Amino acid sequence: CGQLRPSMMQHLLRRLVFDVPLLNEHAKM
Amino acid sequence: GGGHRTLLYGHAILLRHSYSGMYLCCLSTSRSSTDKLAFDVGLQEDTTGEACWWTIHPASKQRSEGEKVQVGDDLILVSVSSERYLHLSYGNSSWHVDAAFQQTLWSVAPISSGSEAAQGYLIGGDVLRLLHGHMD
Amino acid sequence: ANVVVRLLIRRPECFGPALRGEGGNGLLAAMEEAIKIAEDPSRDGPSP
Amino acid sequence: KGEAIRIRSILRSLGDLVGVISIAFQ
Amino acid sequence: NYHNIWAKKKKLELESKGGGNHPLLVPYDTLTAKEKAKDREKAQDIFK
Amino acid sequence: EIQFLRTDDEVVLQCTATIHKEQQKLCLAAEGFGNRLCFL
Amino acid sequence: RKEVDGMGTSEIKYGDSICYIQHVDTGLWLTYQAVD
Structure with a gap:
């Protein structure tokens, strides 16, 4: 409920910054 | 029924x-x-319709489907839900009946019928209480 | 798929290293057993 | 509802399927 | 700061290993609260 | 001579499994009041 | 007959008739020891 919900968005953010492959950030959105 | x-x-x-x-x-x-x-x-x-039955299959290739079962013919039995055969395993140093995929033969034998009716006459397996004619 | 499952199930002979009834037929046991073969040694168990 | 529940139960019997959460990290 | 210099030691281990994959690791920046109490009952007490 | 298995007729099942290097012929049994299971 | 697999005159009727037992290995007959 409130253990580690919010940090997944930080993970997806850090992936989205340096996301080399196309059509990969589009599915992370 | 029929x-x-x-x-x-x-x-x-x-x-x-x-x-x-x-x-x-x-x-x-x-x-x-x-x-x-x-x-x-x-x-x-x-007894709830679909989950009610077993199903016969012949033992080895001597009689196929559609044939009438005769006395003494070894059989194979299988569910409709689980589809397991009537397995005969060994649990722990002893027998244990289960349902599995390793099939096993399963014979039958006659015991009685409807025509083989008592109507007062004696049939084996019947319980009873003995009686004297004079002393009862 | 139905016939494939019905045919696999008569002879589910995916006999892994050691589990009950069958050889394997259970994933975490065989996988953790084989990672010992894989991680330190080569593809083989005894290999450098 | 169409006889697929048999094969789905057969699949469910192999639970280790609950326990593959460990393998998903290992 | 504390438990992520610790997890940075672990990250240097996984960097030198050549990119392993084994479950026994969670850094502190995204740590679930199941393993954080042993750190909490001193990291909050210093702040107390 | 010939006779078949009608509906509504008492029967009994049999098997034959080796045990201790000997063929122990058995039958199927069930006592459904305390144990819903089946023994031999 | 010896192997009783053929039917052949279903014999015993309950209640009407009366019978007598015989242990076959000994051939003894049952009797009531009427005590004093």
């Missing part, structure tokens, strides 16, 4: 224990773990 129909291979059968009315039938038995993947469909009276 009344004393015959029995054919491939038919969907229903059994019933004689003295207790617990129809041996397709039930949600998910308990035994001797083999660690096998069932034992025990006794319970839930």
Whole structure:
């Protein structure tokens, strides 16, 4: 409920910054 | 029903224990773990259409489907729900009946019928209480 | 798929290293057993 | 509702399927 | 700061290993609260 | 001579399994009041 | 007959008739020891 919900968005953010492959950030959105 | 129909291979059968009315039938038995993947469909009276039956298949290639079962013909039995055969395993240094995929032969034998009726006459297996004619 | 499952199930002979009834037929046991073969040694168990 | 529940239960019997959460990290 | 210099030691281990994959690791920046109490009952007490 | 298995006729099942290097012929049994399971 | 597999005159009727037992290995007959 409130253990580690919010940090997944930080993970997806850090992936989205340096996301080399196309059509990969589009599915992370 | 129909009344004393015959029995054919491939038919969907229903059994019933004689003295207790617990129809041996397709039930949600998910308990035994001797083999660690096998069932034992025990006794319970839930004759509920689809989950009701077993099904015959012949033992070896001498009689095919559609044929009438004769006396003494060894058989194979299988559920409709689990599809396991009537497995004969060995649990722990002893016998243990289960339902699995390793099939096993299963003979039958006659005991009685409807024409073989008492109507006061004696039949084996019958309980009774003995009586003197004078002293009772 | 129905016939494939019905045919696999008569002879589910995916006999892994050691489990009950069958050889394997269970994933975490065989996988953790084989990672010992894989991680330190080569593809083989005894290999450098 | 169309006889697929048999094969789905057969699949469900192999639970280790609950326990593959460990393998999903290992 | 504390438990992520610790997890940075672990990250240097996984960097030198050549990119392993084994479950026994969670850094502190995204740590679930099941393993954080042993750190909490001193990291909050210093702040107390 | 010939006779078949009608409906509504008492029967009994049999098997034959080796045990201790000997063929022990058995039958199927069930006592459904305390134990819903089946023994031999 | 010896192997009783053929039917041949279903014999015993309950209540009407009276019978007598015989242990076959000994051939003894049952009797009532009427005590004093």
